[PDB]
């Protein structure tokens, strides 16, 4: 909470890392290796319970998208990591979601903004923390143009002729907008060798307590941590 409320984004330094997959034990020591994208399930390491490797994900990995994507997902889906940011009155929080949609990368930000449109306005209103126009330009462009930006400056000292000029009838110092509208992010992390992946809801019994888990198949890891956000 302290590191988030101070308007500091730690995601600018996080880099891509592999997934650890190894079973070993020692005397107060544990060295676990990591793997990457490839034929991990086809190498036949013969070190797990079964002849193949185990690939499972927790319950909080998928979110409902049919309400805006009723069209059939004919194609190869992609796994994206979403970490939104909130800006309110002396209160902030984190939300490490996991989006999974077949839409294009450039449309992910638009979809996130459309889904969170009920809170985007509130975030924009709460992010404003930290006036006479000139409608005579269209009439003074061609006629009555006092273009003396060089002749009246390089010749005279201009220390006494600066009397009327313009004043804007205001006084402002600093307009922070880039660090206020940043509330959406997505990164291409993790892919799938095959599409049409079907999820099954089952139960598992391991360790000292039974916890609900979801078993999946045809899921791998890898990629790069290329941060390409689209604020709105």
């Amino acid at each position: 909470r302290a590191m988030v409320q101070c308007h500091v984004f730690p995601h600018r330094f996080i880099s891509f890392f592999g997934s650890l997959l190894e079973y070993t034990i020692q005397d107060n020591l544990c060295n676990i290796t990591a793997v990457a994208k490839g034929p991990q399930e086809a190498a036949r390491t013969d070190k797990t319970s079964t002849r193949r490797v185990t690939a499972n994900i927790p319950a909080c990995v998928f979110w409902d998208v049919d309400k805006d994507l009723h069209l059939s997902a004919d194609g190869l889906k992609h796994v994206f990591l979403v970490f939104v940011y909130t800006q309110r009155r002396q209160r902030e929080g984190v939300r490490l979601h996991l989006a999974l949609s077949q839409l294009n990368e450039q449309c992910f930000g638009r979809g996130i903004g459309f889904l969170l449109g009920r809170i985007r306005a509130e975030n924009a209103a709460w992010g404003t923390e930290g006036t006479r126009a000139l409608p005579l330009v269209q009439l003074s462009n061609d006629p009555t143009s006092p273009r003396c930006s060089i002749g009246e400056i390089t010749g005279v000292n201009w220390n006494l002729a600066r009397q009327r000029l313009y004043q804007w009838t205001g006084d402002f110092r600093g307009l922070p907008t880039q660090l206020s509208c940043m509330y959406a992010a997505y990164t291409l992390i993790g892919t799938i060798p095959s599409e049409s992946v079907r999820y099954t809801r089952r139960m598992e019994r391991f360790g000292g307590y039974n916890v609900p888990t979801i078993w999946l198949e045809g899921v791998v890891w890898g990629g790069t941590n290329t941060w390409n956000e689209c604020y709105y």
């Binding site: 990457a36 006036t131 006479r132 126009a133 000139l134 409608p135 462009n141 061609d142 790069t224 290329t226």
Partner: protein, 120 residues
């Protein structure tokens, strides 16, 4: 530096507190001021173009319509700004191609050792 040179009244603040470290270390950078190099002849035009683009972009907001405020077609400048932005869009693209996969660490106690790398 250019503002100090062309202002005849430089501000006393020029560095402030900008120290880059790594897990509690020291970089010891920017320790020279009187040194001069000929590489600065190409960046003045770049910074001038950047500041001109910023000025025209922030001035076009108040020239079209003040939505937030409660013989000259005036189009050549806008077209030139759009063309320069489009040209610089491809120039700013410097996405990395090679990937680094370091086994353990070669520079943990002494930099300049056996380092692993991949071609992903």
């Amino acid at each position: 530096r250019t503002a100090a040179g062309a202002q005849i009244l430089p501000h006393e603040v020029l560095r402030g507190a900008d120290v880059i470290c790594y897990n509690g270390r020291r970089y010891e950078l920017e320790t020279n001021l009187q040194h001069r190099d000929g590489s600065d002849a190409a960046i003045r035009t770049l910074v001038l173009n950047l500041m001109f683009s910023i000025n025209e972009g922030c001035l076009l907001l108040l020239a079209l319509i003040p939505t937030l405020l409660v013989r000259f077609p005036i189009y050549e400048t806008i077209s030139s700004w759009i063309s320069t932005s489009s040209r610089l869009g491809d120039t700013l693209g410097t996405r990395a191609i090679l990937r680094v996969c370091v086994f353990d660490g070669p520079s943990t106690v002494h930099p300049g050792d056996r380092t692993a790398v991949i071609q992903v």
